[PDB]
Amino acid sequence: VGEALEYVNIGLSHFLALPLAQRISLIIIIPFIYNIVWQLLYSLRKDRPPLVFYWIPWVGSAVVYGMKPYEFFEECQKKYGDIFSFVLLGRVMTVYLGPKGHEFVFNAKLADVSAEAAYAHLTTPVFGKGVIYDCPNSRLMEQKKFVKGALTKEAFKSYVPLIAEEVYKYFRDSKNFRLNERTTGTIDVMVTQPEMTIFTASRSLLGKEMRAKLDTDFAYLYSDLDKGFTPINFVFPNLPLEHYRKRDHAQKAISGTYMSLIKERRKNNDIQDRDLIDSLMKNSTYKDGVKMTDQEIANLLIGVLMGGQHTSAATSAWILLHLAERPDVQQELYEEQMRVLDGGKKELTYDLLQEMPLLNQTIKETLRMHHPLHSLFRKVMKDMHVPNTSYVIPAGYHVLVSPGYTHLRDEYFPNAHQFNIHRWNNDSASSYSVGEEVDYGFGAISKGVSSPYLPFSGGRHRCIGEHFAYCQLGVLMSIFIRTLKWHYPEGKTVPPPDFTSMVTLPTGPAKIIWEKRNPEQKIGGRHH
Ligand code: HEM
Ligand SMILES: OC(Cn1cncn1)(Cn1cncn1)c1ccc(F)cc1F
């Protein structure tokens, strides 16, 4: 009776007096035991998707998910089906695989899920305050509208010869090529492509001043800011270490440079239609009348250039890598170049790029097999009912959607693990809406988000850099094809993806051997 409760207190007393050898042992085994008991109890709930069993509390399935996410998804899909949850470094992730998952997450109501609540911890320290995910959604919608204003057909027409010039400059001057001095050589594509991507993106979107600054020690700052863009920042966004200080310094230094150019252009009234800087200076006033600050404009520049940097560089690296073991595809692409550009006598233009279906299909196919973002997250803000199930996703959970996984399923893409650009025959468009449209604030886009092919997502958070990426990748690959042949070192093949980084770039070093199609061909212009 009450004598029982006396022994409760006595037991508590004897608990606190255990040797700290047993106490430490107990504060390990008790959370461990409770974790297992909780999961087994959790599995009784029929309004919750199945939860992947895990031994270590808090950690969850982080190790297997972090290293081989698609293999994790497939095993989980076999056991539980398309909807299942797993614990990830303190968080509960609810995965919804397949097209229905795309609809459930990408077309979720604004009040139901939050992208910025999921990503702000990562991106804000890198890009700066006030923009992208450090603001309400309505602000992001208009920022996208602003950026999209410099991403027009007319802009792409002017970008193409600029991007082309940068590619030829890189072939001429970079130590990785030097085509005027060498006719063959070995490159690491994870060295060349990030460089070619930043040179071409900077020249076209930022302008000649900012491009020129990449020829200096300023370039190291981009590398510093680069290191801040890492999954580690999802768990440890701010540790007092040098990595984080160089990042924060780089952000200030780079945004300061952008603001300097911005204020100079405005003081000289030198505001044209050259680049994204000009565009944002003329067009960055929200609908409620508030103007973006020069800091916010610079930070938006950083975010847009940085994101486009990683997605595009990774993509062109995969293209080169897949093509390295496919001389048949290089050959077919080369013939297309000769036919469309009249044996090379025509100058490449944006309009001529659109008449290169096989080149564009090659980009399209590479993006199928190598979605640079294997997982997209939203934080659940309100309890969500999953249609045609009894499942309820409580607020505090995160939903995870993965079109890249569906890209690699035989059911939706026959022989999915085979690189075949001809699966897109007479369907070379980067993507398109097969029906009704909707405008979230940055232009009419597809209402339905059910396509098995969805490398640019859909819904309010859909990519707006798709046409720029195709323009950039197109020009670049057009010139690679016309200038070089390339192949693997003996016994080398397409490397496995590095799923552990921010984008799922190839595992390096990923080397290819190039050779000039025309050994005698010289690239003009001056250099020291
Ligand atoms: C192959 C190239 C690219 C791919 C595959 C890609 C993919 C994506 C995806 C999947 C999203 C949606 C993320 C989500 O749903 O959470 C997205 C959003 C976005 N991307 Fe891209 N991207 C690429 C290139 C670019 C480029 C070149 C730019 C800029 C020039 C850019 C700027 C943006 C912006 C501003 C968003 C909006 C983010 C949001 O609304 O939350 N992307 N991209
Ligand atoms: O969506 C990203 C952020 N992200 C999400 N998972 C991993 N990285 C990447 N990205 C997508 N297209 C281009 N970059 C992004 C979105 C917008 C942006 F401005 C920067 C940025 F990193």
Side-chain angles (χ1 to χ4, degrees):
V1 52
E3 200 174 21
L5 285 185
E6 289 187 358
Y7 279 97
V8 174
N9 287 342
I10 289 198
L12 162 68
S13 159
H14 284 221
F15 178 92
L16 308 193
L18 290 169
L20 73 91
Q22 279 173 262
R23 193 105 68 87
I24 293 293
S25 166
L26 258 177
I27 63 185
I28 288 183
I29 194 62
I30 288 181
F32 174 82
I33 293 307
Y34 176 61
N35 187 43
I36 298 175
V37 176
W38 177 88
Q39 293 176 64
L40 264 40
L41 283 181
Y42 187 89
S43 64
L44 305 174
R45 300 207 54 160
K46 314 213 188 309
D47 62 338
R48 297 288 187 274
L51 179 63
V52 178
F53 184 79
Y54 63 103
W55 288 119
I56 310 179
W58 187 86
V59 170
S61 312
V63 171
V64 56
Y65 165 75
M67 276 153 50
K68 298 295 179 61
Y70 288 168
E71 298 181 61
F72 177 66
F73 291 167
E74 189 184 358
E75 292 311 305
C76 292
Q77 191 184 28
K78 290 177 188 173
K79 300 179 182 179
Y80 313 104
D82 292 348
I83 318 175
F84 53 84
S85 294
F86 70 94
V87 175
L88 172 61
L89 306 169
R91 309 164 237 281
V92 185
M93 317 294 306
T94 301
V95 178
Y96 197 159
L97 297 179
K100 278 291 191 47
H102 305 168
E103 276 293 338
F104 182 75
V105 175
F106 289 139
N107 268 345
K109 282 151 168 42
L110 183 63
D112 283 346
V113 301
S114 173
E116 75 270 30
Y119 290 115
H121 304 281
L122 163 65
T123 58
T124 301
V126 190
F127 305 157
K129 291 182 177 179
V131 299
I132 305 168
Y133 298 131
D134 188 48
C135 55
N137 189 263
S138 58
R139 290 297 198 234
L140 170 63
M141 291 305 98
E142 297 202 81
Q143 283 156 22
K144 291 173 74 166
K145 181 178 62 180
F146 301 152
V147 175
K148 201 164 157 184
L151 301 178
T152 67
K153 179 172 183 180
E154 288 74 31
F156 295 141
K157 291 175 187 309
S158 73
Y159 290 166
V160 160
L162 296 179
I163 293 173
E165 184 190 308
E166 289 299 317
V167 171
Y168 279 111
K169 281 174 55 187
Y170 191 87
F171 280 175
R172 185 193 63 204
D173 303 332
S174 176
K175 308 206 182 220
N176 296 290
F177 289 103
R178 302 290 186 84
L179 298 194
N180 285 358
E181 306 161 1
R182 300 200 290 149
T183 63
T184 184
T186 303
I187 65 175
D188 183 355
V189 303
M190 281 310 299
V191 159
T192 56
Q193 294 330 99
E195 297 187 356
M196 298 189 83
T197 300
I198 192 59
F199 291 149
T200 57
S202 296
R203 179 64 190 87
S204 59
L205 295 178
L206 298 185
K208 194 143 189 172
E209 299 89 319
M210 294 306 104
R211 167 60 183 95
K213 290 187 182 301
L214 284 179
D215 290 326
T216 76
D217 292 342
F218 193 80
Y220 295 92
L221 297 175
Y222 284 94
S223 189
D224 294 334
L225 196 62
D226 224 29
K227 317 303 177 53
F229 198 53
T230 287
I232 288 158
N233 297 30
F234 263 142
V235 175
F236 299 104
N238 283 283
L239 303 180
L241 284 174
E242 289 179 353
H243 157 270
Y244 295 80
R245 296 178 181 180
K246 281 186 138 298
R247 173 200 70 187
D248 298 339
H249 179 246
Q251 188 282 334
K252 294 183 177 65
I254 293 169
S255 55
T257 307
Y258 294 169
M259 285 187 298
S260 178
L261 177 58
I262 286 171
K263 277 145 157 56
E264 184 77 2
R265 285 187 180 180
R266 189 160 44 229
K267 287 177 182 182
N268 296 331
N269 209 336
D270 190 17
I271 311 176
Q272 301 295 287
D273 310 278
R274 297 156 288 186
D275 47 41
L276 180 52
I277 293 178
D278 276 335
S279 178
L280 292 171
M281 288 182 65
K282 304 200 293 184
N283 184 26
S284 45
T285 305
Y286 300 116
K287 60 188 178 187
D288 67 352
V290 182
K291 290 188 170 179
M292 296 188 70
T293 67
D294 283 3
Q295 185 67 62
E296 294 163 335
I297 291 181
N299 298 349
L300 179 63
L301 289 168
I302 293 179
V304 161
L305 267 284
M306 162 95 65
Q309 169 69 19
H310 289 70
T311 51
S312 179
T315 297
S316 71
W318 285 119
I319 293 179
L320 295 172
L321 285 170
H322 275 285
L323 262 51
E325 64 182 13
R326 297 298 295 280
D328 57 321
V329 180
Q330 293 183 41
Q331 180 175 91
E332 193 173 26
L333 289 175
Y334 186 80
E335 191 280 331
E336 184 177 72
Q337 294 296 308
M338 292 304 99
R339 171 162 38 83
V340 174
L341 299 181
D342 205 353
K345 263 116 62 174
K346 278 189 191 171
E347 172 166 353
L348 186 63
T349 66
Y350 188 70
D351 290 317
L352 289 169
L353 258 182
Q354 315 313 306
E355 308 203 270
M356 299 171 171
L358 295 176
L359 176 56
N360 292 311
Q361 285 169 229
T362 300
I363 303 173
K364 194 169 185 180
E365 177 71 340
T366 305
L367 283 173
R368 184 187 63 80
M369 293 185 66
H370 298 285
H371 197 327
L373 313 182
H374 65 71
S375 297
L376 293 320
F377 313 115
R378 309 286 189 265
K379 198 181 176 181
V380 182
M381 308 280 84
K382 291 177 48 181
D383 295 354
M384 296 186 78
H385 167 251
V386 182
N388 303 292
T389 80
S390 50
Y391 295 146
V392 172
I393 314 300
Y397 280 24
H398 304 75
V399 283
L400 189 163
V401 60
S402 185
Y405 175 86
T406 293
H407 289 180
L408 294 164
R409 302 292 284 168
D410 288 331
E411 316 89 83
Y412 292 99
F413 306 92
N415 292 326
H417 291 274
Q418 169 68 19
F419 185 89
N420 179 13
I421 72 174
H422 293 293
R423 76 171 70 247
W424 305 107
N425 277 359
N426 301 129
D427 185 11
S428 66
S430 57
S431 68
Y432 62 91
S433 181
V434 291
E436 205 175 343
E437 290 188 335
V438 58
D439 190 325
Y440 298 95
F442 55 90
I445 58 174
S446 173
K447 182 156 139 57
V449 192
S450 261
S451 174
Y453 188 69
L454 209 67
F456 297 102
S457 279
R460 64 181 63 261
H461 289 291
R462 190 187 191 288
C463 184
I464 53 162
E466 152 179 26
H467 301 115
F468 175 78
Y470 265 75
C471 181
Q472 182 185 39
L473 294 167
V475 172
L476 174 76
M477 282 318 301
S478 168
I479 292 166
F480 255 99
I481 289 291
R482 274 180 290 136
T483 310
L484 307 167
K485 292 177 179 177
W486 61 94
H487 61 269
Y488 279 113
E490 274 165 67
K492 293 295 176 174
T493 189
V494 181
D498 184 345
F499 293 104
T500 73
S501 50
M502 259 298 116
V503 304
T504 62
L505 45 82
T507 299
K511 293 184 185 292
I512 62 177
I513 301 163
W514 57 266
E515 63 190 66
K516 295 175 68 183
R517 282 178 180 272
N518 184 0
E520 288 179 2
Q521 181 193 3
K522 297 291 178 175
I523 298 173
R526 310 128 82 202
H527 74 281
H528 300 164

